[PDB]
Design a protein around this motif. Structure first.
Motif, PDB file in Angstrom:
ATOM      1  N   UNK A 178       0.824  -1.213   0.000  1.00 21.06           N
ATOM      2  CA  UNK A 178       0.000   0.000   0.000  1.00 21.06           C
ATOM      3  C   UNK A 178       0.859   1.265   0.000  1.00 21.06           C
ATOM      4  N   UNK A 179       2.167   1.096   0.123  1.00 20.94           N
ATOM      5  CA  UNK A 179       3.118   2.186  -0.058  1.00 20.94           C
ATOM      6  C   UNK A 179       4.534   1.663  -0.294  1.00 20.94           C
ATOM      7  N   UNK A 180       5.452   2.547  -0.677  1.00 21.99           N
ATOM      8  CA  UNK A 180       6.880   2.205  -0.696  1.00 21.99           C
ATOM      9  C   UNK A 180       7.377   1.908   0.722  1.00 21.99           C
ATOM     10  N   UNK A 181       6.728   2.530   1.693  1.00 26.48           N
ATOM     11  CA  UNK A 181       6.972   2.234   3.093  1.00 26.48           C
ATOM     12  C   UNK A 181       5.625   2.010   3.723  1.00 26.48           C
ATOM     13  N   UNK A 182       5.568   1.048   4.649  1.00 29.14           N
ATOM     14  CA  UNK A 182       4.348   0.814   5.401  1.00 29.14           C
ATOM     15  C   UNK A 182       4.615   0.104   6.731  1.00 29.14           C
ATOM     16  N   UNK A 183       3.706   0.319   7.667  1.00 32.52           N
ATOM     17  CA  UNK A 183       3.771  -0.349   8.951  1.00 32.52           C
ATOM     18  C   UNK A 183       2.618  -1.324   9.040  1.00 32.52           C
ATOM     19  N   UNK A 184       2.902  -2.579   9.370  1.00 34.20           N
ATOM     20  CA  UNK A 184       1.828  -3.518   9.642  1.00 34.20           C
ATOM     21  C   UNK A 184       1.648  -3.737  11.156  1.00 34.20           C
ATOM     22  N   UNK A 185       0.492  -3.336  11.705  1.00 31.27           N
ATOM     23  CA  UNK A 185       0.352  -3.345  13.175  1.00 31.27           C
ATOM     24  C   UNK A 185       0.238  -4.750  13.752  1.00 31.27           C
ATOM     25  N   UNK A 186      -0.117  -5.733  12.924  1.00 28.83           N
ATOM     26  CA  UNK A 186      -0.153  -7.138  13.368  1.00 28.83           C
ATOM     27  C   UNK A 186       1.242  -7.770  13.319  1.00 28.83           C
ATOM     28  N   UNK A 187       2.011  -7.506  12.265  1.00 27.22           N
ATOM     29  CA  UNK A 187       3.409  -7.920  12.237  1.00 27.22           C
ATOM     30  C   UNK A 187       4.211  -7.104  13.261  1.00 27.22           C
ATOM     31  N   UNK A 188       3.720  -5.911  13.589  1.00 30.64           N
ATOM     32  CA  UNK A 188       4.539  -4.903  14.269  1.00 30.64           C
ATOM     33  C   UNK A 188       5.883  -4.807  13.564  1.00 30.64           C
ATOM     34  N   UNK A 189       5.856  -4.545  12.262  1.00 32.52           N
ATOM     35  CA  UNK A 189       7.092  -4.502  11.515  1.00 32.52           C
ATOM     36  C   UNK A 189       6.912  -3.478  10.423  1.00 32.52           C
ATOM     37  N   UNK A 190       8.032  -2.990   9.904  1.00 27.88           N
ATOM     38  CA  UNK A 190       8.001  -1.911   8.933  1.00 27.88           C
ATOM     39  C   UNK A 190       8.716  -2.312   7.656  1.00 27.88           C
ATOM     40  N   UNK A 191       8.053  -2.067   6.531  1.00 31.31           N
ATOM     41  CA  UNK A 191       8.515  -2.393   5.182  1.00 31.31           C
ATOM     42  C   UNK A 191       9.045  -1.125   4.546  1.00 31.31           C
ATOM     43  N   UNK A 192      10.220  -1.201   3.919  1.00 31.85           N
ATOM     44  CA  UNK A 192      10.792  -0.095   3.124  1.00 31.85           C
ATOM     45  C   UNK A 192      11.314  -0.548   1.758  1.00 31.85           C
ATOM     46  N   UNK A 193      11.242   0.349   0.774  1.00 32.71           N
ATOM     47  CA  UNK A 193      11.667   0.031  -0.585  1.00 32.71           C
ATOM     48  C   UNK A 193      13.135  -0.377  -0.567  1.00 32.71           C
ATOM     49  N   UNK A 194      13.903   0.266   0.305  1.00 34.75           N
ATOM     50  CA  UNK A 194      15.304  -0.097   0.497  1.00 34.75           C
ATOM     51  C   UNK A 194      15.437  -0.856   1.817  1.00 34.75           C
ATOM     52  N   UNK A 195      16.227  -1.925   1.836  1.00 34.70           N
ATOM     53  CA  UNK A 195      16.330  -2.740   3.039  1.00 34.70           C
ATOM     54  C   UNK A 195      15.841  -4.169   2.830  1.00 34.70           C
ATOM     55  N   UNK A 196      16.002  -5.016   3.846  1.00 36.61           N
ATOM     56  CA  UNK A 196      15.774  -6.452   3.651  1.00 36.61           C
ATOM     57  C   UNK A 196      14.383  -6.966   4.042  1.00 36.61           C
ATOM     58  N   UNK A 197      13.675  -6.235   4.901  1.00 37.17           N
ATOM     59  CA  UNK A 197      12.340  -6.661   5.338  1.00 37.17           C
ATOM     60  C   UNK A 197      11.394  -6.945   4.152  1.00 37.17           C
ATOM     61  N   UNK A 198      11.504  -6.143   3.091  1.00 37.79           N
ATOM     62  CA  UNK A 198      10.657  -6.311   1.901  1.00 37.79           C
ATOM     63  C   UNK A 198      10.838  -7.666   1.231  1.00 37.79           C
ATOM     64  N   UNK A 199      11.967  -8.338   1.472  1.00 36.55           N
ATOM     65  CA  UNK A 199      12.160  -9.676   0.888  1.00 36.55           C
ATOM     66  C   UNK A 199      11.304 -10.763   1.547  1.00 36.55           C
TER      67      UNK A 199
END
Ligand SMILES: *[C@@H]1O[C@H](CO)[C@@H](O[C@@H]2O[C@H](CO)[C@@H](O[C@@H]3O[C@H](CO[C@H]4O[C@H](CO)[C@@H](O)[C@H](O[C@H]5O[C@H](CO)[C@@H](O)[C@H](O)[C@@H]5O[C@H]5O[C@H](CO)[C@@H](O)[C@H](O)[C@@H]5O)[C@@H]4O)[C@@H](O)[C@H](O)[C@@H]3O)[C@H](O)[C@H]2NC(C)=O)[C@H](O)[C@H]1NC(C)=O
Ligand SMILES: *[C@@H]1O[C@H](CO)[C@@H](O[C@@H]2O[C@H](CO)[C@@H](O)[C@H](O)[C@H]2NC(C)=O)[C@H](O)[C@H]1NC(C)=O
Ligand SMILES: *[C@@H]1O[C@H](CO)[C@@H](O[C@@H]2O[C@H](CO)[C@@H](O)[C@H](O)[C@H]2NC(C)=O)[C@H](O)[C@H]1NC(C)=O
Ligand SMILES: CCCCCCCCCCCCCCCC(=O)OC[C@@H](O)COP(=O)(O)O
Ligand SMILES: [Ca+2]
Ligand SMILES: [K+]
Ligand code: NA
Ligand SMILES: [Zn+2]
Ligand SMILES: [Zn+2]
Length: 781
Positions: A178-199
């Motif tokens: 839903x964005x290049x960056x986003x926070x999922x409150x159930x994962x309690x984790x943050x996704x970014x276009x740069x970085x490894x979480x997106x994998x």
């Protein structure tokens, strides 16, 4: 653990899946720290650059070189793309005359035309106007293939949500990116276009094209390229894969360029500095086409040239700061820029006060360059609400502006704005045997492409938000034959069965229809329910005995129709309807008693054909619950705008009705999901009201005597108890209502999802044409 000691010898960019502990030699390898120790050395050669020179022709093969100009390079599939032009007297593809490709001309062993998707980042639709002076290869693809003047991206108009939408056919709220960056409150984790979480795969929903292909036994090349791999190597790799043995060769390929987005950010979209990056992309397209010609594939492959979004003029000097509106911005986190999403800095922070924050952000500066929305209030066309990763509080930002948390330059361009904004539109060109030749098509939405790519590959698409068939007109062959949905509920046709004396509602008052007021057939109800057709001189409706109001009200208004007033003695006139039982009717007492809710009519008395008719408009079965705030909009629409449309378009056919979407998922609510009723009653309150206004595309013909294609505009207006959305609403309706309506323009298809109705079932047009009509969005740009 990955045994990095293995070798990528004879394995460079292998397609086979390889998991630990074996080391890898593909694209994802770097990103996963799993490349073999000689990946960079064996697979990323750069020696001598990317072009053959005369002094290299018929050289002896040096395996150290990036590409080859030796006599055997062809059968080995690793010539530099310009090898034949330089070494064998051939012409660059771009220098060859365009010629219709009527059927695929593919080498022995090719069973279907491969598909190559060439994606470019931040390619604004208007850049194409630069034409062959800047982009000769692309201009040839555009002029000789099938092109749209632009393609509409999804909101937010940034890279990740759009690329994954292209791949899945889904809205971001459905695919999850839903964005290049986003926070999922159930994962309690943050996704970014740069970085490894997106994998991590948990972020990625739906079923992207490469998985659809794979699950149906069609082989895909990579849809990911490590940023460190030069474009020339990406192109050489695709060409090498196309040279593989019949039993290894993929059928679908993707190329991605991060330009012209990068230079767009630095210099802005109208910068002179944009010419060079556009030339470079064109050179890359040329390498691919020259390469394909070398392989005898240039009249075999289908090529899609497509962008993710456009680019706008945005500078440091045009930034709104939340600190100017709010007292303590250090306690909130803002996803900022060309959109805003707000959440407390500490997740679940109990002192977070969203109503107070919204109040402080609403119409507080005359020139305010953003507008706050609770996500359920965003225009329905954006489809941006049904996901836990979308913050409740959103800011829609004005084009050319940024929003930042606080003041605490090197960019002149950005994107992310409302996806109907002209600067955000992007490119689509289709070229090859399956596309049409020298054909322009209307603009369309990127959600539609997944179905078409599935068509191009013989695949059955996973469930998605495209409307399959709506893009059949782009294709010479491989079109999809749509089938009309089957009606689930047939109407009752009740005659008189009651007398005025039968009704205790608290109200007081002092053929040739179906053929003429349903120009395109009655809508089909696609769910299980009970409803009545009701005929009137001036209108027809499907009255629901369950929701106690019409699902739809349909009427035609001639260009020369006359607008009358509502006589003062009929101001509060509501009449019971002797065709519908008292028990299946609303009652005026509920209204009289509800201090906040009034009512309106779907067919406007103002447009009655005669006082005997006009009295029909006051029926209890034409009435719907409306807040006074909304009535301001609706009355102006009913009294001024409908007639104004009829005058401008040579009459209009109108279908209006209620929408219930209390859980903001874009779909018809079932009874259990409705959460608001008129006080003391069981009359359900719509969250929105829709209107679909149809006329003849050829305006010289009246709406009711249209021989050919149709023209449609529609809206989904939010039913709200205030006009806080409209900063100028204290003024006369002529100063703000149309502006609100434009923001809430909609596709007929959107209305269909939200109502379970199917429109345009009886026309003289093809089903495919009608599907195109249903996906049309009138943007007002
Ligand atoms: C655009 O088109 C899509 C695709 O058809 C429509 O979305 C579908 O809506 C239907 C009907 O409401 C949902 O049906 C429910 O399905 C669930 C089971 O769903 C699970 O299994 C399916 C099948 O594998 C899977 O696709 C689902 O994926 C959802 O949840 C995932 C896990 O968290 C997530 O990764 C993925 O992004 C997706 O989330 C989205 O949908 C959920 C609702 O399921 C939503 O809460 C979330 O916020 C996202 O929007 C999931 O693993 C059953 O239990 C129910 O009974 C019912 O059958 C589909 O799940 C849903 N499909 C997808 C892929 O979203 C949209 O309605 C359509 N929009 C419009 C406006 O027309
Ligand atoms: C990691 O990879 C290296 C190279 O492939 C492995 O080295 C081989 O080990 C086997 C088993 O002892 C020997 O027979 C070979 O001579 C080795 N090959 C080379 C070229 O060194 C090593 O075993 C792997 N490490 C593991 C399996 O944990
Ligand atoms: C909304 O804006 C008003 C200012 O218009 C803020 O009011 C201030 O509140 C602080 C303490 O909260 C007072 O000490 C100031 O006197 C107020 N300022 C003015 C100019 O009256 C209010 O804090 C803002 N609300 C939020 C949530 O940020
Ligand atoms: C089948 C559907 C289409 C598939 C198309 C090809 C997909 C190729 C993916 C290639 C690797 C993609 C991700 C690249 C990320 C990237 O390079 O971002 C650059 C950033 O500045 C974008 O930030 P922004 O411009 O702010 O949104
Ligand atoms: Ca709903
Ligand atoms: K009232
Ligand atoms: Na207002
Ligand atoms: Zn992008
Ligand atoms: Zn960008």
């Amino acid at each position: 653990w990955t045994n990095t000691s293995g070798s990528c010898k004879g394995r460079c960019f292998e397609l086979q899946e390889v998991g630990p502990p074996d080391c890898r030699c593909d694209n994802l390898c770097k990103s996963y720290s799993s490349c073999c120790h000689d990946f960079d050395e064996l697979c990323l050669k750069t020696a001598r650059g990317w072009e053959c020179t005369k002094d290299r022709c018929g050289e002896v093969r040096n395996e150290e070189n990036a590409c080859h100009c030796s006599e055997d390079c062809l059968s080995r599939g690793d010539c530099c793309t310009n090898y034949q032009v330089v070494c064998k007297g051939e012409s660059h593809w771009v220098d060859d005359d365009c010629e219709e490709i009527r059927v695929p001309e593919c080498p022995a062993g090719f069973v279907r035309p491969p598909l190559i998707i060439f994606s470019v980042d931040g390619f604004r639709a208007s850049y194409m106007k630069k034409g062959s002076k800047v982009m000769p290869n692309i201009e040839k693809l555009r002029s000789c293939g099938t092109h749209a003047p632009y393609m509409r991206p999804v909101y937010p108009t940034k890279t990740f949500p759009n690329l994954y939408t292209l791949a899945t056919g889904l809205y971001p709220e459905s695919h999850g990116i839903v964005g290049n960056s986003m926070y999922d409150p159930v994962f309690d984790a943050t996704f970014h276009l740069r970085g490894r979480e997106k994998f991590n795969h948990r972020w990625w929903g739906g079923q992207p094209l490469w998985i659809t292909a794979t699950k149906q036994g069609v082989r895909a090349g990579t849809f990911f390229w490590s940023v460190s791999i030069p474009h020339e190597r990406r192109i050489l790799t695709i060409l090498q894969w196309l040279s593989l043995p019949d039993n290894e060769r993929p059928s679908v390929y993707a190329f991605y360029s991060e330009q012209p987005d990068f230079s767009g950010h630095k210099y802005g979209p109208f910068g002179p500095e944009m010419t060079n990056p556009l030339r470079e992309i064109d050179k890359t397209v040329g390498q691919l086409m020259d390469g394909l010609k070398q392989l005898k594939l240039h009249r075999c492959v289908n090529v899609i040239f497509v962008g993710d979004h456009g680019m706008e003029d945005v500078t440091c000097d045009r930034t709104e700061f939340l600190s100017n509106y709010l007292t303590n911005v250090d306690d909130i986190t803002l996803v900022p820029g060309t959109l805003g999403r707000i959440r407390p800095k500490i997740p679940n922070n109990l002192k977070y006060d969203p109503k107070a924050i919204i109040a402080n952000l609403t119409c507080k500066k005359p020139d305010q360059h953003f507008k706050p929305y609770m996500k359920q209030h965003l225009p329905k066309r954006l489809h941006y609400a049904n996901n836990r990763r979308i913050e409740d509080l959103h800011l829609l930002v004005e084009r050319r502006w940024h929003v930042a948390r606080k003041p605490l330059c090197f960019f002149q361009g950005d994107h992310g704005f409302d996806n109907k904004v002209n600067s955000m539109q992007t490119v689509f060109v289709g070229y090859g045997p399956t596309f049409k030749y020298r054909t322009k098509v209307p603009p369309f939405e990127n959600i539609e492409l997944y179905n078409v790519m599935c068509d191009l590959l013989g695949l059955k698409p996973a469930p998605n938000n495209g409307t399959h068939g709506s893009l059949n007109h782009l294709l010479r062959t491989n079109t999809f034959r749509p089938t009309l949905p089957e009606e689930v509920s047939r109407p009752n046709y009740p005659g008189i069965m009651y007398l005025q004396s039968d009704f205790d509602l608290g109200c007081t008052c002092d053929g040739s229809t179906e053929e003429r007021h349903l120009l395109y057939g009655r809508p089909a109800v696609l769910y299980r329910t009970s409803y009545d057709i009701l005929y009137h001189t001036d209108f027809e409706s499907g009255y629901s005995e369950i929701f106690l109001m019409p699902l739809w009200t349909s009427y035609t208004i001639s260009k020369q129709a006359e607008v009358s007033s509502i006589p003062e003695h009929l101001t509060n006139c509501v009449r019971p309807d002797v065709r519908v039982s008292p028990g299946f009717s609303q009652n005026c007492l509920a209204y009289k008693n509800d201090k906040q809710m009034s009512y309106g009519f779907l067919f406007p008395p103002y447009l009655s054909s005669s006082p005997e008719a006009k009295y029909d408009a006051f029926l209890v079965t034409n009435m719907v619950p409306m807040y006074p705030a909304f009535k301001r909009v609706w009355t102006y629409f009913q009294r001024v705008l409908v007639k104004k449309y009829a005058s401008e378009r040579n009459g209009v056919n109108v279908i209006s009705g209620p929408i219930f979407d209390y859980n903001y998922n874009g779909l018809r609510d079932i009874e259990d999901e409705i959460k608001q009723y008129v006080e003391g009653s069981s009359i359900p309150v719509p969250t929105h009201y829709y209107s679909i206004i149809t006329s003849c595309l050829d305006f010289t013909q009246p709406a009711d005597k249209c021989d050919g294609p149709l023209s449609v505009s529609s809206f989904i207006l939010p039913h709200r108890p205030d006009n806080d959305e409209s900063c100028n609403s204290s003024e006369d309706e002529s100063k703000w209502v149309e502006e609100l309506m434009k923001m809430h323009t909609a596709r007929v298809r959107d209305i269909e999802h939200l109502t379970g109705l199917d429109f345009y079932r009886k026309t003289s047009r093809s089903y495919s044409e009608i599907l195109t009509l249903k996906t049309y969005l009138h943007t007002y740009e």
